[PDB]
Write a protein that binds this DNA or RNA. Structure first.
Lengths: 213, 210, 210, 213, 212, 215, 212, 215
DNA sequence: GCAAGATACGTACTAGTACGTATCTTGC
DNA sequence: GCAAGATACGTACTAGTACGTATCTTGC
């Protein structure tokens, strides 16, 4: 068990380094200094900065805390989005998801062998799973393209987050994520599921409080 | 005036290829073919260059054919921009300018990524108010938050497009984004009038090249 | 590809200002802002530069809006070209290219002034045959001699315009030249259809800038 | 009288130099060597290369031999044009008119103080005089712009000549000058004066023969 | 684990060499690019020379092949046409691009790289294929497989050089297909020649199958 | 002052070539070229302004002042002779140092630092090879609609590689054999009937053409 | 005849100086430009210095004036606004442009040009005008014509310098009119101030009349 | 390694300025700057890459590190003090060698050879002068719709000339008198009532401001 | 407190230029 | 045959670079 704890001490250190200076500018020593583990300690778990970065990308979907199982399936999606918004904002929520976001958004190069496809594909299928469930519980309009909507939400979320970083340091992210869902859902969500959805910041906070405890 | 454009174009292409922090003046010099001396007249630092390319995407990006249906103009703008980003030598400025704005970097690099975004946002809002007054969108829609939503929404659709299929699907992805965002604020029987078609998309590309 | 255009433009402006024989590579370097090295990739001699700018006035000069009345197209071409020559930064290539062709120099400078003229002549002839087949000019008109007459006629009208009122009157002088040459070969009731007006002249200027 | 002959020996030498290398490239020594006169011989008549060039421009209208006084005034214009065409072609006709043409067509610079306006203004008024006479002898249509036609002919002649130099070394100039007049005259010349005009090369040669003798 | 870190370094080395060439490259460049530790590097490779020699020793060894073919000459043709795609784009295989630069660049005898070793292996690999095709009855009776193998290896490398110089490798596929189209009439059995597929559209299909 | 200008210019060119061939473009210095040429600094800088200019000028001398082959009966033999002659010229410890330097300058890569035009010697090579094939087409020794342009790109292309591989394997020792191989295998795909057996691929001939063209 | 050849040389000298400045200029440049003989040149001027000094000694002397005015301050204003046009275009007067460069450029005391001489004359010329306007009752009682003349000469030269640097003399006319608009309220009699015409359209009309 | 970098950089800048002021841009050499600065070649080239870069950097130091005037009661007096202070600074056998070099570099012309940006020091001069006038407008010491921008171009413009003429006539000896003249005559055209008599145009003050700002 | 690195300064070259002298060309 | 000039070569610098060592910074 002393191996699985020290690997996470490495991964968080790498992600922390990657968040602040990007994949390019970061060195293996940067990650080594932050983690405060030995050269050989590192070498057991990760062979290279690439292998490090790929792993922090790989644990982006599994990293996000899952909310208590909601009765309305679209509300789960709404709550998850506003949780992720609160997680990125205050920071102290999660350290991996920040650097893993920056690793995915950063353009980089084909010469660096990062696979930004993995955290983005797996994120889309997860969003598709919820929308596929919500359809089985009859929450979405009869002829909606569940696949195109997953891609759209996964896209739009990334960019609403990008803008919110630039303009306000993510201070308004809650309001903007809420805005995205408040405007996107009238197109595919059943009317009446629309009146039943809880957009308020007061509710979304009471999910951030509950996820920690 | 002549060399500054040649420099800025070359700067954008280098910034697109390696990103701000990896890039050097040296690389921009070599890619521009201007003399050492010709560059320093205009730009002393790499920081000065990047800032200049960012403030350039305002007036470098080609304007759209004016229309009475202001939402179709807004739809054209984003579809044109979807093709500009796809190209390579369609516009070298926008591609580098995007990568400069989207990429995070550091506060240590003093680049103001806010002002291209400030411009992008103010422009889409100005067009939506010109759609509001002409009775195209619901009477009391939050125009400021909508434009902020459109800028943000596009940015991510673009990023997601870039990673997944080297920007190739961006035309369709922006079409979906506009189709799905519109019913939340468009007035009745306006969505049906709007032209989302790919063969119109490549047709507005011709009228912009001046 | 990028620098070659920047070089050629700068070469044309220097050639316009001082003429071929007075000009040096040194002057073109300084006016272009490209490195010594960047120029030699493309051009070893001053002769090589001039020849390149001459062969450029073929494809650099912007094309005219296609019309069913082929003589109106021919009239537009020469009126557009009358405004291109008047400017300064409208097109720097044509102005230098003209001065290079018109000026006499020497046989010692190996410049082939024939091939821009060969191009200019063949182009106006090709348009006149497209007017002949569409029944716009008298059935058996000497098309080869007419185009040669039009190229020659323009060249002098231009020179005379340049000397007398710094090219300012060229629009009117080319209008007169077309008005007076037309009845000798135009079919009945075609001269009356043709639009010579100055406010059309400035209007075709917009559609050419691409 | 030994002064007026030696001044023309200078002027022809200058014009000859100016024809072959233009105003710019030519030196005062170039003119001095060709003329074979002394430094002081030159200085009496001309102070500078500019003063030289201006003088050769100034004697362009007076230089052209005037044809025997024709009955048809437009035929005089036609014959004069085809004479000038023959004069430039064979060369041996006149040495001044070649260099004086090149001095006028060459763009030069505002920094050189040549006045290319003089040979061109005086050439236009002369063409206007003929067209003004032809009107008094009723050879031109009732509402023709005599001033615009002088400018047009003076222009078009310069450029028909320019093209003919580039393409054929002026070999076809006769045919091209003829062509210009054959196409320009239907617009302003009276019909019937048009049938009375002699365009043939055989006639125009018999003016070149006669002008020498 | 150790083959993992070796590969990471080799790929980075191959990139730097393809970028700046042997002389201009530093070991310092290769370190920053691999993203391994100083210690990790100096265990597998001591000097710049050893790095270069290793990438060279992997040219044939790490070249992605094809689906096994009925015609071993079409196997040969598809491999070559694949290499033309594998050399052009920003994504190919860095090992190939790297060693191709290392082999073709002259340098000097002052540097101690063995350029003959990748060349020998690539010639032998080509020969082996032509030998395999002789027993399967594809090539004609009195053919010199050695001399033909040397021809192909040589011809390809220069077809590839001209292409880089003139079109930045753009026309490489058309140049290679051209090469194989004129050379094979000399040694292929007629009946193989008409059953051969040089087509550009087939070249895309072998490239799409190479996403594996 | 023409004659002596040509003489010193050639000393510089031969010296530059030798330097380029032994260290390449980037490693070479003007310093190196001065030492070997024997010329003064101002003498060289009168003729060539930069290392690039020097290097370009040797690539120019690959085209011009390349030993002329005799006017042959068959245009293809004239092409075969030209290829095997160059093979001899790249081989020997002198032959031409200019052809050796040029090939190295053409085949090496160099950084995006340099502005050396490698397209130019290759274009002239291809245009000359095309011209020989087009003359062979009118004589009817090649197929009447064979792609004369695509073949020239093929020959220039392949030869360049045949040479490079030969340099690596045998220091260009076996070059002429390899070039003969190249031609023996490529010609049948576009040569007319009868024409192929008439050609003389022998090292017995390739050397007679060599010593004749040396004079 | 001799004043003819002197002028020809001086104008050419003034051009070269305006183009390359004093130090860069050669006498060789001035010869080729004047188009006179070596002998003709060396009779009037021996050295580059003597050439430069002569153009400088002609700054006021060869400056085209105006039609005589009712208001001597509007005479002053029109002259200054004329100079702004006479300095901008490719055609002005080369003597002005030349000497203005010669005066404003620093050089060194190592060269022996007297920059004070054109400056003295231009200051005296300005003073004389203001003195002429005092007796005609245009300027106010307790005004220092000397100090004002020095101000104007100084102010103009720098207004002219800034204009060259920022707009390549494009805005010089607007800058000079601006200068005269703010300075004159200090010394002009009110009643002259409202009768004064700074207008750009009038500036064109004085320039059109200067075609003589 | 910041502190010592600033120290050597300033030695180079002061030395460059001195050189530029005495021979101008074109005549000056890197050689000259090395000799006077005392610095090694590699030391200078670490900080400045070309003569242009040097010359630009001294024009940059005209703006920054120009002696600050005290926060005055009247914004126009603060402008009057700034002008007369610079007049003292251009005058004295030291004062600042940087302001002297900068002025010469700005006012000279140079060939189309050089790529020195003279617009930049002038723009900063004009923008600072405009800022002072705009603050004077809010305080209501100037006319409420006076063209604050056109005045800044006027002051920078005229001062530059007042100085140039002063250099020629009296080696800048009478500069402060001339500058006082300039201000006494220009201010009434845009100053509010009362404001003008409150201003202190005296050389009695201009020197008190000088020694205070020197410390 | 110190290992990594960033930064600052130093040395030894090579590249580039300005201007000087020599030597051929050429048009009478 | 030779004066003007164009051209070729020479000398003495200054500019620019590559790579070396020293010295500070900084994040644990």
């Amino acid at each position: 068990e002393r191996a699985i704890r020290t690997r996470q001490t490495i991964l968080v250190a790498a992600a922390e380094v990657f968040d602040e200076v990007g994949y390019e500018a970061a060195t293996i020593s940067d990650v080594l200094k932050r983690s405060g583990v030995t050269k050989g300690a590192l070498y057991f778990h990760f062979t290279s900065k690439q292998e490090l970065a790929q792993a922090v990308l790989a644990e982006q979907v599994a990293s996000l805390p899952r909310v208590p199982e909601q009765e309305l399936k679209l509300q789960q999606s709404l709550d998850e989005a506003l949780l992720l918004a609160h997680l990125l904002r205050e920071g102290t929520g999660d350290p991996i998801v920040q650097g893993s976001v920056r690793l995915t958004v950063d353009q980089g190069s084909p010469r660096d062998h990062l696979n930004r496809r993995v955290p983005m594909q797996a994120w889309t299928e997860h969003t598709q799973s919820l929308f596929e469930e919500a359809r089985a519980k009859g929450e979405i309009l009869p002829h909606a393209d569940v696949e195109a909507l997953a891609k759209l939400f996964v896209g739009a979320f990334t960019g609403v987050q990008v803008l919110s970083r630039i303009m306000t340091g993510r201070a308004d992210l809650a309001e903007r994520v809420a805005d995205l869902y408040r405007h996107l859902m009238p197109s595919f969500a059943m009317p009446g599921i629309l009146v039943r959805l809880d957009f308020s910041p007061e509710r979304g906070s009471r999910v951030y409080e509950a996820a920690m405890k």
